[PDB]
Design a protein around this ligand. Sequence first.
Ligand SMILES: CCCCCCCCCCCCCCCCC[C@@H](O)O[C@H](CO[C@H](O)CCCCCCCCCCCCCCC)COP(=O)(O)OCC[N+](C)(C)C
Ligand SMILES: NC(=O)C1=CN([C@@H]2O[C@H](COP(=O)(O)OP(=O)(O)OC[C@H]3O[C@@H](n4cnc5c(N)ncnc54)[C@H](OP(=O)(O)O)[C@@H]3O)[C@@H](O)[C@H]2O)C=CC1
Ligand code: SF4
Ligand code: SF4
Ligand code: SF4
Ligand SMILES: [Zn+2]
Lengths: 63, 96, 176, 144, 386, 156, 342, 208, 115
Amino acid sequence: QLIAVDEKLDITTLTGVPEEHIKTRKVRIFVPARNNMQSGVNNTKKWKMEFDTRERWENPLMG
Amino acid sequence: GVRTSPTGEKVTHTGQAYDDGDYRRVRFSDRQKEVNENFAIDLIAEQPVSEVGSRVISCDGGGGALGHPRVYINLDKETKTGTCGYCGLQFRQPHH
Amino acid sequence: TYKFVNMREPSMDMKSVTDRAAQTLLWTELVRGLGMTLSYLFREPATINYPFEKGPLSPRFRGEHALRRYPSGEERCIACKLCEAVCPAQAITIEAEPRADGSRRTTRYDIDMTKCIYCGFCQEACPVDAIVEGPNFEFSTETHEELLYNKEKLLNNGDKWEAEIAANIQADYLYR
Amino acid sequence: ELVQVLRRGLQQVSGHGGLRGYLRVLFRANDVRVGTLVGEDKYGNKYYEDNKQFFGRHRWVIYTTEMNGRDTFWDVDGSMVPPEWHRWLHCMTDDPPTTKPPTARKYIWTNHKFNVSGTPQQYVPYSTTRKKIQEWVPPSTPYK
Amino acid sequence: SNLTLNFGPQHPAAHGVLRLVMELSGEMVRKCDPHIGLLHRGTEKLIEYKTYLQALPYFDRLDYVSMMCNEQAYSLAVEKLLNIQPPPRAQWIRVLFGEITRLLNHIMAVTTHALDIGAMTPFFWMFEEREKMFEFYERVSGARMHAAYIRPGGVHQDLPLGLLDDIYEFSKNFSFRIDELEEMLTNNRIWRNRTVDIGVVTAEDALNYGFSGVMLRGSGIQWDLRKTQPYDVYDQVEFDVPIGSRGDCYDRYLCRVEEMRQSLRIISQCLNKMPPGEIKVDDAKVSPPKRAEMKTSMESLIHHFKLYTEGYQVPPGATYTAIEAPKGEFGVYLVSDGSSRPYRCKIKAPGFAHLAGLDKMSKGHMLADVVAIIGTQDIVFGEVDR
Amino acid sequence: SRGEYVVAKLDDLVNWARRSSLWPMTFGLACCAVEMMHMAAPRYDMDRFGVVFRASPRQSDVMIVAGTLTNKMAPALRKVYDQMPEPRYVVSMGSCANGGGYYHYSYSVVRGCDRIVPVDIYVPGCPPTAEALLYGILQLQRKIKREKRLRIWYRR
Amino acid sequence: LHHALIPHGKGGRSSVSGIVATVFGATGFLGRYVVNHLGRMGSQVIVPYRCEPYDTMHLRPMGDLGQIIFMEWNGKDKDSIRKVVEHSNVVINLVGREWETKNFDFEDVFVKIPHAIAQVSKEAGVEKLIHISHLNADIKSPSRYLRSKAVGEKEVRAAFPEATIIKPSDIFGREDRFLNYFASMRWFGGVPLISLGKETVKQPVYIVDVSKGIINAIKDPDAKGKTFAFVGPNRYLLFDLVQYIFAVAYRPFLPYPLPHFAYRWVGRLFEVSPFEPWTTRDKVERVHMSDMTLPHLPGLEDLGIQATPLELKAIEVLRRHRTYRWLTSEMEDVKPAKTVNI
Amino acid sequence: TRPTIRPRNDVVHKQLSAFGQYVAEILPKYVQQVQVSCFNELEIFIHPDGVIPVLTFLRDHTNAQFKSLADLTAVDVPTRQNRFEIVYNLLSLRFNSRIRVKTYTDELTPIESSVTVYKAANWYEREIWDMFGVFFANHPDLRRILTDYGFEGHPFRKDFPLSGYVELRYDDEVKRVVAEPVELAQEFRKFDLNSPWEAFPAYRQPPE
Amino acid sequence: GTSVKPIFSRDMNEAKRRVRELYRAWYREVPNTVHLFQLDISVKQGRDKVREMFMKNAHVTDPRVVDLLVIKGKMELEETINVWKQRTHIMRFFHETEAPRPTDFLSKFYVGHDP
Ligand SMILES: CCCCCCCCCCCCCCCCC[C@@H](O)O[C@H](CO[C@H](O)CCCCCCCCCCCCCCC)COP(=O)(O)OCC[N+](C)(C)C
Ligand SMILES: NC(=O)C1=CN([C@@H]2O[C@H](COP(=O)(O)OP(=O)(O)OC[C@H]3O[C@@H](n4cnc5c(N)ncnc54)[C@H](OP(=O)(O)O)[C@@H]3O)[C@@H](O)[C@H]2O)C=CC1
Ligand code: SF4
Ligand code: SF4
Ligand code: SF4
Ligand SMILES: [Zn+2]
């Protein structure tokens, strides 16, 4: 038998992601732009979801 | 073609050398810095320019299949030699 | 087509029962095993006298990496980054720029030998036989940092092992 | 037959340069076999062959007692073999560098070096690239 | 209250990374609970980030006792998805080295089982033959175990000019080594007492519990993938399938010894019937061209570039490809989405199902019996844990 | 001096006894242990160097980390290392134990066993050959020969 | 700030903290904790060592690749000091011994070596210097240890005027000589105490608190030329403290009074050991001396450190000294000791 | 077309199509689709409520006799409302055949455990729960099998990062192994390998 | 009816009762965990940690999510009781080694770029 949950879907507590990477993250949903160097359009069919760029630094060893 | 930095550190062929105030030199204390002594730019500069009697020459780096992909060099400019894009060897037509 | 491995029953002859009883009481199979061990004791051992003797190898052997040169002394590498793209372990890091003479040459060529799986895909991908897997295998270090190779170390390895690398390549490039 | 193997042992003792040489090779290499001298190294290593031993014991090297800077009477290791004899000794080829010398190049090391780990000559990694971002330099003159 | 014991991971009989939680009444084993994942490396997720060529060495490292067989299974799956066919000489080379790999794995399994039970001597006798086969591997590829020789279009390189003779020399002598092993173990009453009627599994329980390979054939089930669903050239070689009668450790030991003999037979047949020709598919959009062509031909250079940077694309689809690996049925469920990277790769290893049934086989047995049962299942945890 | 000569001789004797009797723990994780098994095989015969495997960590002098170290296994490796009586040594065998190797970016793999235990010798390869591991073991012996415990104690 | 030293990352193992620290005496009790804290944030740590390199193995897993560099040094050689402090912006001095060897006395490890370190660091361009003294250091104490401590403290201040001086008191931890010292005298039947330990007051401090205070003083701009006292939150009588120590270890406590001269004589007898002495006359003097109270000095709470009471950390040190019967006993079962607080 | 192209087998294709029609006819209540691939593999897509019936049929019917469970696994497709896809691979020794049964579920809907039909499923289902978080109802012992103790999250999900969230190291202050937020000396270098040109015209999708 | 089937509970009341059962089991287990694992924490500290872990998911309103959370908590307790976990796993709940990340704007601005 069915129980008729009428709430908003929220699986946040089940994914095991740290709360820092849930509340302070901003995602971008977009169709990627065509690479202007080529005329092919096969990479502009699907939607992509990506995350905001964070800090990258240089390793003290090997750089 | 190694040269010495003002701090006394050997300079690599890429030109890298830590400055005087750089703490990262401490990794070379009680040890050494690895610098390759044979500089490819200086070594390729010693090769004589090859005189050929054709407008277009071919280069594969020598050794046949043991070299690089075969390419064709135009030699129509008289003020500059033709350089291989893989090997660095220089070719020219008889001038003067 | 199949065969049975353990579907044999033994004869019930009086003499056969006697042999089985003698085997049970006098341990003939165990004597046979002792005889096998004794025969092995008098054979010549297979041990080799390392390090004065070495195990056999092949020209195809994959070991410590090296960067090679043309006979003129110019580096073979042209920074196409095919080895970097093919590396299954992402163990290669490459940075390049136009050289002072305009040649297309690397400024950084790093191989993390603690990431490398020694598959040899890099030397198969390389179009100019620049990066190779050498014949050396005795290069254990005392620290982790010594196994993070940069371009200077790899060029030194090439200069050190070229006399053997070139000869190994000569014997196998017709299979490639 | 037993007297023949005893004679062979006595011949092994005699052929190493007397009792002193026999003891030296016995305590250094843990082996007293005698083979034909294939060649002598630039650094003092000697390379011997004997085709009657089985595959793996038919080629060997007696290492030098004095490599680049260290005393290798007791402390020897496989990294002391130069690359040409490295190819011969590991059975990658049947041709010794004495009969089939390698090609000469101006950039090839004229002096082989062993594994220098744990010594002041060890390799230390570093970034070979130049600085990416250049910072603004304030003027040396006062502004007011 | 029963005694609770940690068996492994640091235990000689634990095969490295097994944590067997055992509940014992005295020395009787009341319950076995295998904790695994101590060698879980997340191989499938990593494969999802590589191209099809880049994912091949993972299959080498899966079952590190049977390397060419894992390569062959992955290659067969990718070839089925690509709708290409390897050349005949490549198929004969694949079957030859698969039989050599079967010999290597069976040596390892039998000798380690004997060492666990207590017979320490045949291990040293047979690991010299293992060393010679490692030499064959290294001569053909340059690596003693992790060859990556078998590729999804054929094989990487051709055999060196003197390899077949050396393989024949090894094979004409390996039978006496098997004979010495059997003299050591087959009729020994201590060995039989340790193995007879130990870990007995019925045919129906073996089928339901997902068993395969020897674990099936020891119970009398007449099944073998090389006979029922042959893949490379196995329909052109004649060999016999050993069948057990009692379903215990002794029958499985006998089956493995006879399978070594049959692998020798197949190796002889492959040596005689090796054909000439090319070694990889003559399709430069899948297999790389030769180095001489790449340095002379524009198309060859372009295809070399694109194959070693992006890789070939595989048409969208999903396949399940299984082979008779030396440890059982080794399978790959491979899902492609039209790209040059696999969408999903699920690895089916016989060790997973065989270890999931260790508790069933160990009922009413002692600690040493459980050691024997672990030995008889031929478990390598690289494939169990993935 | 006279005391320094005596402590030097005692140092030599102790180092020789320690390096000539190296007992590794019977400990292996993955593919590399197989090559380790080939070092005990008749061709190389590590026994002839004074090297024998012993199961109990209390009766071991060296630990060889031969294989991948996962996050699940790391506490067990640390535990069996801590129960080793001193002096003790660690040899890292292969890329996975060295720095993670082919699984360096995995979620469940420790990026190098030197994050868990201190390491004396790093043997590179995937897997290192039995000759490479033999070279590493002899290098560890040469390192043990170089240690000066009583000389340093006498100069305190 | 020399761009190569600009902090980067989230303060983890692979981050850059901007600290290049030469830690003298890093192979000691406090040195391991200091190096651990420095390597946690991703600092370049330079370890000068004079012992056998084996005795430094435990310091190797404490930093990322290349972040811990071990160099040999000699205490009496200033060239070695210059070599090890040339490229550092912080120098920490943790050199010290609780006994005098035939090569180094109390004024060699507490006056000469600290002064040489401070002078070479000042002339090598080092920006920050951290020097560890004792809380009870003064030039008129019966203990030569503390007199040398005070002389060396003032000499270090003279050589490096903007140095940070930290004066802890009886650090307790897993590898200490405070709790372990009192727990180990159970093997002598009774516990000898001067005047039954009823006229001595101790204020021990947690080792982690001291290491955190040192790390915080490194990155505190205002702590350039100040002097800190690192003491615990509670002051105990010596008798009560030892009784609590034996109660946590679950050992029978049989104290007895011993006159000062007899205890000094047993200390002199134990001093003859060519190895590390079990106890010395100086150790006896320091054990039975009350802790000074210096309220005018800044403390741990001025560096943001809340001192951890002994009650929450005594079990982690004293559980090793229990027998199998009492090995699993919990922490709150031992009835915390009486405190002489104000 | 002979040398480099994999040959076809129409007989097996016809047999598999006939048996797929047979199975669809016998079980109309649960069977939603039947397919045969170009390399002769039979696939049956069923409603999630038919896991126990269909499998039982395929194991016990005289004409099916799919006695062996070769493999059971899940596939994560985030773009679908029912995120997870459950795949059963079965082998019939009597008829020398292989079949595949596929169903679907999401993060909150349990799937009925098939341990009663196949014992081999017991671990596989556990693995699915460990790697994807799909709950199996009426499982005799459902717990983590592959991941570390106390591991949070399900790694085989597509939104789970490759290197995870935490990493392990030994800490000497606490004298034990500790977990910290993950930090990488070298970040994994993502490669954009897809070509901007179509490869297979036969699989082109309508342009909406 | 939204066409959703339950795991165990049909409404929030049954889910709450299951939560209370799991909480009781954890509260009873805490002293045994402290004794067996030889932890240097008090029973009160462990019980407060259990309370914090339970309150971290106090905002859930879906009975299915509460059911899955209770199932995961039951597996965690079963891991703890059978000594499958080690002291390291149990002490990972406390983050003793991790340096506390400041939460106010100025400290975040001083240390770096992360919000
Ligand atoms: C009295 C009870 C306590 C002491 C017990 C002593 C028992 C007898 C002593 C044992 C004698 C053996 C020691 C010397 C053997 C070394 C052999 C030689 O080859 O060593 C070389 C170097 O010599 C050693 O360094 C010297 C070790 C001992 C130095 C002097 C001995 C001092 C003995 C004094 C004992 C008195 C104590 C009294 C206590 C009351 C280097 O060899 P090495 O290369 O590595 O190994 C071979 C590998 N190969 C193949 C590459 C060659
Ligand atoms: N522990 C305590 O109760 C408190 C400590 N004190 C002070 O705190 C400092 C560190 O304390 P702690 O860690 O416990 O002391 P330790 O005895 O544990 O370690 C002393 C360190 O100093 C080095 N060292 C000692 N003597 C010399 C020397 N002659 N030459 C070179 N190095 C030497 C040691 O190196 P090596 O291992 O090679 O000998 C060692 O690394 C010390 O200066 C001490 O005086 C302050 C109040 C009390
Ligand atoms: S051998 Fe393989 S893993 Fe190593 S650098 Fe080359 S491609 Fe990468
Ligand atoms: S080594 Fe070869 S493949 Fe790699 S960048 Fe250089 S030329 Fe290209
Ligand atoms: S280094 Fe290679 S062979 Fe060794 S355990 Fe890791 S993957 Fe296996
Ligand atoms: Zn050219």
